[PDB]
Design a protein around this ligand. Structure first.
Ligand code: NA
Ligand code: NA
Ligand SMILES: [Rb+]
Ligand SMILES: [Rb+]
Ligand SMILES: [Rb+]
Ligand SMILES: [Rb+]
Ligand SMILES: [Rb+]
Ligand SMILES: [Rb+]
Length: 480
Protein backbone atom coordinates (compact mmCIF):
# COMPACT_ATOMS: atom_id res chain seq x y z
CA UNK A 1 0.00 0.00 0.00
CA UNK A 2 1.13 3.59 0.47
CA UNK A 3 0.88 6.21 -2.26
CA UNK A 4 2.74 8.56 -4.64
CA UNK A 5 0.95 8.44 -7.95
CA UNK A 6 2.35 9.37 -11.32
CA UNK A 7 0.25 9.95 -14.42
CA UNK A 8 1.49 9.54 -17.99
CA UNK A 9 0.01 10.96 -21.19
CA UNK A 10 0.58 7.96 -23.46
CA UNK A 11 0.79 9.75 -26.81
CA UNK A 12 2.35 12.67 -28.64
CA UNK A 13 1.18 14.73 -31.58
CA UNK A 14 3.35 13.02 -34.18
CA UNK A 15 2.84 9.39 -33.26
CA UNK A 16 2.71 7.12 -36.30
CA UNK A 17 -0.71 6.48 -37.82
CA UNK A 18 -0.08 2.74 -37.82
CA UNK A 19 -3.03 1.94 -35.56
CA UNK A 20 -0.60 -0.11 -33.47
CA UNK A 21 -0.51 2.25 -30.52
CA UNK A 22 -3.14 0.46 -28.39
CA UNK A 23 -1.04 -2.64 -28.78
CA UNK A 24 2.15 -0.87 -27.71
CA UNK A 25 0.25 0.28 -24.62
CA UNK A 26 -0.63 -3.31 -23.87
CA UNK A 27 2.97 -4.55 -24.08
CA UNK A 28 4.26 -1.53 -22.22
CA UNK A 29 2.00 -1.91 -19.18
CA UNK A 30 4.26 -3.89 -16.85
CA UNK A 31 7.32 -1.83 -17.73
CA UNK A 32 5.41 1.36 -16.94
CA UNK A 33 3.92 0.06 -13.70
CA UNK A 34 7.31 -1.11 -12.57
CA UNK A 35 8.92 2.23 -13.49
CA UNK A 36 6.56 4.06 -11.16
CA UNK A 37 3.66 4.93 -13.44
CA UNK A 38 0.33 4.44 -11.71
CA UNK A 39 -2.04 6.04 -14.18
CA UNK A 40 -2.35 6.45 -17.94
CA UNK A 41 -4.17 9.22 -19.77
CA UNK A 42 -5.14 7.85 -23.16
CA UNK A 43 -5.98 10.08 -26.14
CA UNK A 44 -9.53 10.46 -27.54
CA UNK A 45 -10.29 6.85 -28.43
CA UNK A 46 -13.26 7.62 -30.66
CA UNK A 47 -13.45 8.15 -34.44
CA UNK A 48 -12.29 11.56 -35.54
CA UNK A 49 -12.44 13.57 -38.76
CA UNK A 50 -10.09 11.06 -40.38
CA UNK A 51 -8.06 8.01 -39.42
CA UNK A 52 -4.93 10.07 -38.79
CA UNK A 53 -6.77 12.53 -36.56
CA UNK A 54 -5.12 12.84 -33.16
CA UNK A 55 -8.56 12.66 -31.59
CA UNK A 56 -9.71 16.24 -31.08
CA UNK A 57 -11.36 16.43 -34.48
CA UNK A 58 -14.07 14.25 -32.92
CA UNK A 59 -16.73 12.80 -35.24
CA UNK A 60 -18.49 10.01 -33.33
CA UNK A 61 -17.94 9.58 -29.59
CA UNK A 62 -19.56 6.14 -29.95
CA UNK A 63 -17.14 4.72 -32.52
CA UNK A 64 -14.05 3.50 -30.64
CA UNK A 65 -12.28 2.13 -33.70
CA UNK A 66 -15.12 -0.29 -34.36
CA UNK A 67 -17.15 1.05 -37.29
CA UNK A 68 -16.09 1.90 -40.83
CA UNK A 69 -16.74 5.64 -40.82
CA UNK A 70 -14.76 8.66 -42.00
CA UNK A 71 -12.60 6.53 -44.27
CA UNK A 72 -11.55 4.02 -41.67
CA UNK A 73 -12.60 1.39 -39.16
CA UNK A 74 -9.75 1.74 -36.64
CA UNK A 75 -8.68 5.06 -35.18
CA UNK A 76 -5.11 6.32 -35.38
CA UNK A 77 -4.36 4.24 -32.33
CA UNK A 78 -6.04 1.01 -33.31
CA UNK A 79 -9.18 -1.07 -33.01
CA UNK A 80 -11.71 -1.08 -30.17
CA UNK A 81 -10.80 -4.67 -29.35
CA UNK A 82 -7.10 -3.75 -29.07
CA UNK A 83 -7.91 -0.83 -26.78
CA UNK A 84 -10.02 -3.00 -24.50
CA UNK A 85 -7.17 -5.52 -24.51
CA UNK A 86 -4.72 -2.78 -23.54
CA UNK A 87 -6.92 -1.56 -20.69
CA UNK A 88 -7.11 -5.08 -19.35
CA UNK A 89 -3.34 -5.21 -19.34
CA UNK A 90 -3.06 -1.88 -17.54
CA UNK A 91 -5.59 -2.99 -14.94
CA UNK A 92 -3.91 -6.28 -14.05
CA UNK A 93 -0.75 -4.19 -13.78
CA UNK A 94 -2.37 -1.77 -11.34
CA UNK A 95 -2.53 1.31 -13.56
CA UNK A 96 -5.61 3.54 -13.53
CA UNK A 97 -6.95 4.59 -16.90
CA UNK A 98 -8.23 8.10 -17.56
CA UNK A 99 -10.04 8.86 -20.81
CA UNK A 100 -9.57 12.05 -22.81
CA UNK A 101 -13.00 13.60 -23.29
CA UNK A 102 -13.95 16.01 -26.09
CA UNK A 103 -17.38 17.60 -25.77
CA UNK A 104 -16.73 21.15 -26.88
CA UNK A 105 -17.45 20.39 -30.51
CA UNK A 106 -17.82 17.81 -33.27
CA UNK A 107 -16.20 17.72 -36.68
CA UNK A 108 -16.52 15.82 -39.92
CA UNK A 109 -20.27 16.32 -40.31
CA UNK A 110 -21.67 14.05 -43.02
CA UNK A 111 -23.62 16.86 -44.73
CA UNK A 112 -24.32 20.60 -44.68
CA UNK A 113 -27.47 22.49 -43.66
CA UNK A 114 -28.91 25.94 -44.39
CA UNK A 115 -28.53 28.12 -41.33
CA UNK A 116 -29.34 31.74 -40.55
CA UNK A 117 -26.06 33.11 -39.26
CA UNK A 118 -24.12 36.22 -38.33
CA UNK A 119 -20.41 36.99 -38.46
CA UNK A 120 -18.89 38.01 -35.15
CA UNK A 121 -15.76 39.95 -34.27
CA UNK A 122 -13.02 37.33 -33.76
CA UNK A 123 -11.50 39.38 -30.91
CA UNK A 124 -14.94 39.99 -29.40
CA UNK A 125 -17.56 37.33 -30.11
CA UNK A 126 -20.15 39.45 -28.31
CA UNK A 127 -20.05 41.74 -31.35
CA UNK A 128 -21.64 40.93 -34.71
CA UNK A 129 -20.04 42.43 -37.80
CA UNK A 130 -22.59 41.37 -40.41
CA UNK A 131 -26.32 40.93 -40.63
CA UNK A 132 -27.96 37.53 -40.50
CA UNK A 133 -27.88 35.52 -43.70
CA UNK A 134 -28.13 31.90 -44.68
CA UNK A 135 -24.93 29.89 -44.66
CA UNK A 136 -24.38 26.22 -45.37
CA UNK A 137 -22.76 24.74 -42.27
CA UNK A 138 -21.57 21.17 -41.72
CA UNK A 139 -23.83 20.00 -38.90
CA UNK A 140 -25.55 16.85 -40.12
CA UNK A 141 -24.37 13.67 -38.40
CA UNK A 142 -25.93 10.31 -39.22
CA UNK A 143 -23.09 7.98 -38.30
CA UNK A 144 -23.67 5.71 -41.30
CA UNK A 145 -21.76 2.52 -40.53
CA UNK A 146 -22.58 2.34 -36.82
CA UNK A 147 -26.22 1.51 -37.56
CA UNK A 148 -27.46 3.10 -34.33
CA UNK A 149 -25.45 0.75 -32.09
CA UNK A 150 -25.23 2.07 -28.50
CA UNK A 151 -27.26 5.18 -29.45
CA UNK A 152 -29.39 6.65 -32.24
CA UNK A 153 -29.04 10.31 -31.41
CA UNK A 154 -28.41 12.24 -34.62
CA UNK A 155 -26.83 15.66 -34.57
CA UNK A 156 -28.25 18.61 -36.48
CA UNK A 157 -27.37 22.26 -36.82
CA UNK A 158 -29.85 23.21 -34.09
CA UNK A 159 -27.77 21.31 -31.54
CA UNK A 160 -24.93 23.71 -32.28
CA UNK A 161 -24.68 27.48 -32.28
CA UNK A 162 -21.60 28.17 -34.38
CA UNK A 163 -19.03 27.20 -37.00
CA UNK A 164 -16.00 28.90 -38.57
CA UNK A 165 -16.71 27.99 -42.18
CA UNK A 166 -19.53 28.57 -44.66
CA UNK A 167 -19.75 26.07 -47.50
CA UNK A 168 -22.21 28.19 -49.45
CA UNK A 169 -19.99 31.16 -50.21
CA UNK A 170 -16.91 29.26 -49.03
CA UNK A 171 -15.36 31.66 -46.55
CA UNK A 172 -13.98 31.65 -43.04
CA UNK A 173 -15.69 33.67 -40.34
CA UNK A 174 -16.62 33.11 -36.76
CA UNK A 175 -20.30 32.47 -37.33
CA UNK A 176 -22.78 32.71 -34.47
CA UNK A 177 -26.04 30.98 -35.40
CA UNK A 178 -28.81 33.61 -35.54
CA UNK A 179 -31.06 33.70 -32.50
CA UNK A 180 -28.79 31.32 -30.58
CA UNK A 181 -26.58 32.47 -27.70
CA UNK A 182 -22.91 31.77 -27.04
CA UNK A 183 -22.61 29.31 -24.14
CA UNK A 184 -22.13 30.73 -20.62
CA UNK A 185 -20.34 30.87 -18.38
CA UNK A 186 -17.07 30.45 -20.33
CA UNK A 187 -13.64 32.10 -20.61
CA UNK A 188 -13.95 35.82 -21.34
CA UNK A 189 -10.91 36.08 -23.57
CA UNK A 190 -12.05 37.65 -26.85
CA UNK A 191 -15.12 38.64 -24.91
CA UNK A 192 -16.64 35.16 -25.12
CA UNK A 193 -14.38 32.22 -25.95
CA UNK A 194 -17.26 29.80 -26.33
CA UNK A 195 -16.32 29.11 -29.94
CA UNK A 196 -12.96 27.50 -30.66
CA UNK A 197 -13.23 25.34 -33.76
CA UNK A 198 -15.43 22.79 -35.53
CA UNK A 199 -19.17 22.76 -34.87
CA UNK A 200 -19.61 24.33 -31.44
CA UNK A 201 -22.12 22.55 -29.24
CA UNK A 202 -24.82 24.66 -27.57
CA UNK A 203 -25.58 23.10 -24.18
CA UNK A 204 -28.74 25.12 -23.53
CA UNK A 205 -30.67 22.33 -25.23
CA UNK A 206 -31.76 19.76 -22.62
CA UNK A 207 -31.53 16.91 -25.15
CA UNK A 208 -27.89 17.83 -25.72
CA UNK A 209 -27.25 17.89 -21.98
CA UNK A 210 -28.59 14.37 -21.61
CA UNK A 211 -26.97 12.88 -24.71
CA UNK A 212 -23.56 13.84 -23.42
CA UNK A 213 -24.37 12.67 -19.89
CA UNK A 214 -25.79 9.45 -21.31
CA UNK A 215 -22.79 9.02 -23.60
CA UNK A 216 -20.34 9.76 -20.80
CA UNK A 217 -21.80 6.96 -18.73
CA UNK A 218 -21.81 4.60 -21.74
CA UNK A 219 -18.20 5.52 -22.39
CA UNK A 220 -17.15 5.11 -18.78
CA UNK A 221 -18.87 1.71 -18.51
CA UNK A 222 -17.69 0.38 -21.87
CA UNK A 223 -14.04 1.09 -21.07
CA UNK A 224 -14.16 0.75 -17.26
CA UNK A 225 -12.43 4.09 -16.71
CA UNK A 226 -11.14 5.55 -13.44
CA UNK A 227 -11.27 9.15 -14.50
CA UNK A 228 -11.16 11.66 -17.30
CA UNK A 229 -9.00 14.27 -18.93
CA UNK A 230 -11.53 16.99 -19.76
CA UNK A 231 -10.67 18.76 -23.03
CA UNK A 232 -11.01 22.50 -23.75
CA UNK A 233 -13.25 23.07 -20.71
CA UNK A 234 -12.55 26.80 -20.77
CA UNK A 235 -14.70 26.85 -23.90
CA UNK A 236 -17.43 24.72 -22.37
CA UNK A 237 -20.06 26.42 -20.20
CA UNK A 238 -18.87 25.85 -16.62
CA UNK A 239 -22.22 24.92 -15.10
CA UNK A 240 -22.60 22.01 -17.52
CA UNK A 241 -19.10 20.59 -17.10
CA UNK A 242 -19.93 20.58 -13.39
CA UNK A 243 -23.29 18.90 -13.93
CA UNK A 244 -21.72 16.35 -16.26
CA UNK A 245 -19.01 15.49 -13.75
CA UNK A 246 -21.49 15.08 -10.92
CA UNK A 247 -23.64 12.97 -13.23
CA UNK A 248 -20.84 10.51 -13.99
CA UNK A 249 -19.85 9.95 -10.36
CA UNK A 250 -23.51 9.32 -9.74
CA UNK A 251 -23.75 6.50 -12.31
CA UNK A 252 -20.36 4.90 -11.77
CA UNK A 253 -19.62 2.69 -8.77
CA UNK A 254 -15.83 3.16 -9.03
CA UNK A 255 -14.04 6.37 -8.03
CA UNK A 256 -13.43 8.83 -10.82
CA UNK A 257 -10.46 11.15 -10.93
CA UNK A 258 -11.06 14.24 -13.00
CA UNK A 259 -8.49 16.60 -14.45
CA UNK A 260 -9.72 19.37 -16.69
CA UNK A 261 -7.66 21.22 -19.25
CA UNK A 262 -8.49 24.86 -18.55
CA UNK A 263 -5.71 26.30 -20.67
CA UNK A 264 -4.68 29.72 -19.39
CA UNK A 265 -1.41 31.12 -18.00
CA UNK A 266 -3.34 32.76 -15.14
CA UNK A 267 -3.82 30.86 -11.85
CA UNK A 268 -6.64 33.16 -10.77
CA UNK A 269 -8.64 32.19 -13.83
CA UNK A 270 -8.24 28.55 -12.80
CA UNK A 271 -9.12 29.24 -9.19
CA UNK A 272 -12.30 30.98 -10.31
CA UNK A 273 -13.22 27.95 -12.43
CA UNK A 274 -12.36 25.70 -9.48
CA UNK A 275 -14.67 27.77 -7.26
CA UNK A 276 -17.46 27.29 -9.79
CA UNK A 277 -16.57 23.60 -9.81
CA UNK A 278 -16.71 23.42 -6.03
CA UNK A 279 -13.26 21.84 -6.34
CA UNK A 280 -14.62 18.47 -7.49
CA UNK A 281 -11.77 18.03 -9.96
CA UNK A 282 -8.16 19.05 -10.55
CA UNK A 283 -6.68 21.20 -13.31
CA UNK A 284 -3.44 20.87 -15.25
CA UNK A 285 -1.03 23.44 -13.82
CA UNK A 286 -0.71 25.64 -16.90
CA UNK A 287 1.00 28.60 -15.19
CA UNK A 288 3.63 26.21 -13.90
CA UNK A 289 3.89 24.94 -17.47
CA UNK A 290 4.65 28.46 -18.68
CA UNK A 291 6.90 29.02 -15.70
CA UNK A 292 9.11 26.17 -16.81
CA UNK A 293 8.82 27.58 -20.31
CA UNK A 294 9.81 31.13 -19.39
CA UNK A 295 12.80 29.70 -17.50
CA UNK A 296 13.89 27.41 -20.34
CA UNK A 297 13.71 30.46 -22.59
CA UNK A 298 15.43 33.03 -20.40
CA UNK A 299 18.36 31.02 -19.10
CA UNK A 300 20.22 31.38 -15.82
CA UNK A 301 19.23 35.01 -15.34
CA UNK A 302 15.77 33.68 -14.52
CA UNK A 303 15.33 33.99 -10.74
CA UNK A 304 14.83 30.42 -9.58
CA UNK A 305 13.16 31.66 -6.41
CA UNK A 306 9.97 32.41 -8.35
CA UNK A 307 9.78 29.11 -10.20
CA UNK A 308 6.69 28.01 -8.26
CA UNK A 309 5.36 31.53 -7.97
CA UNK A 310 2.06 31.82 -9.77
CA UNK A 311 1.73 28.09 -10.27
CA UNK A 312 -1.49 26.35 -9.29
CA UNK A 313 0.23 23.61 -7.26
CA UNK A 314 1.75 26.44 -5.20
CA UNK A 315 -1.70 27.43 -3.94
CA UNK A 316 -3.85 24.31 -4.19
CA UNK A 317 -1.42 21.37 -4.47
CA UNK A 318 -4.44 19.17 -3.89
CA UNK A 319 -6.20 20.11 -7.15
CA UNK A 320 -3.20 20.61 -9.43
CA UNK A 321 -1.87 18.16 -12.03
CA UNK A 322 1.73 19.02 -12.81
CA UNK A 323 3.53 18.46 -16.12
CA UNK A 324 6.30 19.89 -18.31
CA UNK A 325 4.85 19.65 -21.85
CA UNK A 326 2.29 17.97 -24.13
CA UNK A 327 0.92 17.60 -27.65
CA UNK A 328 -0.16 21.24 -27.63
CA UNK A 329 3.17 22.66 -26.44
CA UNK A 330 5.43 20.41 -28.49
CA UNK A 331 7.30 22.17 -31.35
CA UNK A 332 5.11 23.38 -34.17
CA UNK A 333 1.78 22.81 -32.42
CA UNK A 334 -0.93 25.32 -31.53
CA UNK A 335 0.17 26.03 -27.96
CA UNK A 336 3.93 25.69 -28.45
CA UNK A 337 5.84 26.52 -25.28
CA UNK A 338 8.44 23.74 -25.34
CA UNK A 339 10.83 23.28 -22.45
CA UNK A 340 14.35 22.84 -23.84
CA UNK A 341 16.43 19.74 -23.10
CA UNK A 342 18.68 21.56 -20.65
CA UNK A 343 15.91 22.74 -18.32
CA UNK A 344 13.53 19.84 -18.79
CA UNK A 345 15.41 17.76 -16.22
CA UNK A 346 14.90 20.41 -13.51
CA UNK A 347 11.20 20.81 -14.34
CA UNK A 348 10.59 17.08 -14.06
CA UNK A 349 12.43 16.94 -10.76
CA UNK A 350 10.28 19.82 -9.52
CA UNK A 351 6.94 18.10 -10.21
CA UNK A 352 8.25 14.62 -9.39
CA UNK A 353 10.12 14.92 -6.09
CA UNK A 354 7.90 17.43 -4.28
CA UNK A 355 4.87 16.50 -2.17
CA UNK A 356 2.33 18.85 -3.67
CA UNK A 357 0.63 18.07 -6.95
CA UNK A 358 -0.21 15.06 -9.11
CA UNK A 359 2.65 14.88 -11.66
CA UNK A 360 2.19 13.80 -15.27
CA UNK A 361 4.89 12.32 -17.50
CA UNK A 362 4.67 13.32 -21.19
CA UNK A 363 4.99 10.49 -23.76
CA UNK A 364 6.95 12.83 -26.00
CA UNK A 365 9.68 13.28 -23.42
CA UNK A 366 9.78 9.71 -22.23
CA UNK A 367 10.13 8.03 -25.63
CA UNK A 368 11.21 11.11 -27.55
CA UNK A 369 9.60 12.95 -30.46
CA UNK A 370 11.27 11.61 -33.66
CA UNK A 371 9.49 14.05 -35.94
CA UNK A 372 11.50 16.89 -34.38
CA UNK A 373 14.71 15.06 -33.52
CA UNK A 374 13.98 15.24 -29.81
CA UNK A 375 15.72 12.44 -27.93
CA UNK A 376 13.95 10.06 -25.55
CA UNK A 377 14.55 11.06 -21.95
CA UNK A 378 13.51 7.69 -20.52
CA UNK A 379 16.78 7.48 -18.59
CA UNK A 380 16.65 10.91 -16.98
CA UNK A 381 12.98 10.49 -16.17
CA UNK A 382 13.13 6.90 -14.90
CA UNK A 383 15.65 7.93 -12.27
CA UNK A 384 13.26 10.62 -11.07
CA UNK A 385 10.42 8.09 -11.12
CA UNK A 386 12.58 5.84 -8.95
CA UNK A 387 13.04 8.86 -6.72
CA UNK A 388 9.30 9.57 -6.52
CA UNK A 389 8.30 5.94 -6.32
CA UNK A 390 10.68 5.13 -3.47
CA UNK A 391 12.23 8.15 -1.86
CA UNK A 392 9.84 11.10 -2.15
CA UNK A 393 8.07 10.65 1.19
CA UNK A 394 7.96 12.35 4.60
CA UNK A 395 8.10 15.93 5.81
CA UNK A 396 9.32 18.42 3.20
CA UNK A 397 11.69 21.36 3.66
CA UNK A 398 12.08 24.03 0.99
CA UNK A 399 15.03 26.20 0.07
CA UNK A 400 14.12 28.60 -2.73
CA UNK A 401 16.61 30.99 -1.12
CA UNK A 402 18.82 31.80 -4.12
CA UNK A 403 18.29 32.93 -7.70
CA UNK A 404 20.41 30.18 -9.30
CA UNK A 405 20.72 27.39 -6.74
CA UNK A 406 17.64 26.09 -4.92
CA UNK A 407 16.53 22.75 -3.57
CA UNK A 408 14.25 20.89 -1.20
CA UNK A 409 14.22 17.72 0.88
CA UNK A 410 11.98 14.92 2.15
CA UNK A 411 12.72 13.24 5.51
CA UNK A 412 11.37 9.87 4.44
CA UNK A 413 8.65 7.91 6.21
CA UNK A 414 8.63 5.15 8.84
CA UNK A 415 6.30 3.18 6.60
CA UNK A 416 8.81 3.26 3.74
CA UNK A 417 12.34 2.13 4.84
CA UNK A 418 15.21 4.14 3.33
CA UNK A 419 12.84 6.70 1.85
CA UNK A 420 14.11 10.26 2.02
CA UNK A 421 15.72 12.57 -0.50
CA UNK A 422 17.40 15.88 -1.14
CA UNK A 423 16.86 17.69 -4.40
CA UNK A 424 19.19 20.44 -5.50
CA UNK A 425 19.68 22.21 -8.79
CA UNK A 426 20.91 25.39 -10.39
CA UNK A 427 19.89 27.02 -13.67
CA UNK A 428 23.10 28.99 -13.50
CA UNK A 429 26.65 28.35 -12.26
CA UNK A 430 26.88 25.39 -9.89
CA UNK A 431 26.88 25.52 -6.12
CA UNK A 432 26.14 23.83 -2.80
CA UNK A 433 23.58 24.27 -0.05
CA UNK A 434 23.09 23.06 3.51
CA UNK A 435 19.63 21.53 3.90
CA UNK A 436 17.91 19.75 6.76
CA UNK A 437 16.72 16.19 6.13
CA UNK A 438 15.67 14.86 9.51
CA UNK A 439 17.93 14.14 12.48
CA UNK A 440 16.73 10.54 12.23
CA UNK A 441 18.77 10.17 9.03
CA UNK A 442 22.00 11.21 10.73
CA UNK A 443 25.18 9.42 9.73
CA UNK A 444 23.67 8.14 6.51
CA UNK A 445 25.62 8.64 3.32
CA UNK A 446 23.61 9.90 0.35
CA UNK A 447 24.43 9.85 -3.36
CA UNK A 448 22.92 11.39 -6.51
CA UNK A 449 20.33 9.14 -8.20
CA UNK A 450 20.84 11.08 -11.46
CA UNK A 451 24.59 10.73 -11.50
CA UNK A 452 24.97 14.37 -12.40
CA UNK A 453 27.20 14.91 -9.38
CA UNK A 454 29.79 12.56 -7.89
CA UNK A 455 29.62 14.12 -4.43
CA UNK A 456 28.87 11.72 -1.61
CA UNK A 457 27.00 13.56 1.17
CA UNK A 458 27.01 12.42 4.77
CA UNK A 459 24.23 13.39 7.16
CA UNK A 460 25.51 14.87 10.43
CA UNK A 461 24.24 14.56 14.01
CA UNK A 462 21.72 17.35 13.66
CA UNK A 463 20.35 15.84 10.45
CA UNK A 464 22.06 18.30 8.11
CA UNK A 465 24.12 17.73 4.98
CA UNK A 466 25.73 19.86 2.30
CA UNK A 467 24.52 19.06 -1.21
CA UNK A 468 26.16 20.04 -4.51
CA UNK A 469 25.28 20.61 -8.15
CA UNK A 470 27.13 21.86 -11.21
CA UNK A 471 25.70 24.57 -13.45
CA UNK A 472 22.34 24.07 -15.13
CA UNK A 473 21.80 20.66 -13.61
CA UNK A 474 19.71 18.87 -11.02
CA UNK A 475 20.64 16.21 -8.52
CA UNK A 476 18.56 14.11 -6.16
CA UNK A 477 20.62 12.60 -3.34
CA UNK A 478 19.19 9.57 -1.55
CA UNK A 479 20.29 6.81 0.77
CA UNK A 480 20.83 4.07 -1.76
NA1 NA B 1 -17.63 25.97 -26.65
NA1 NA C 1 19.28 32.30 -11.96
RB1 LIG D 1 -19.32 5.06 -43.57
RB1 LIG E 1 -22.12 6.04 -7.65
RB1 LIG F 1 5.74 23.84 -21.43
RB1 LIG G 1 14.43 7.33 6.29
RB1 LIG H 1 23.37 9.08 -15.02
RB1 LIG I 1 24.21 4.47 1.50
Amino acid sequence: DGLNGTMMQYYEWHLENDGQHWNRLHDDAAALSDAGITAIWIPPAYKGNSQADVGYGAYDLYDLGEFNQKGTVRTKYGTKAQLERAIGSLKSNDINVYGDVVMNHKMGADFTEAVQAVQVNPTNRWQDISGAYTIDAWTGFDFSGRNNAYSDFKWRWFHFNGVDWDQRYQENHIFRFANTNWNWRVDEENGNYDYLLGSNIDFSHPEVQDELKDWGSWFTDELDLDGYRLDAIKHIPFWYTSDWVRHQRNEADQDLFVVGEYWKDDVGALEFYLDEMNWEMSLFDVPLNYNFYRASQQGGSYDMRNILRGSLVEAHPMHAVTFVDNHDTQPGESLESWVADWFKPLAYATILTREGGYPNVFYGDYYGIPNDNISAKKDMIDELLDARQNYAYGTQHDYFDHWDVVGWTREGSSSRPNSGLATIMSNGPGGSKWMYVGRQNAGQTWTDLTGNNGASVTINGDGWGEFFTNGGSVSVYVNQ
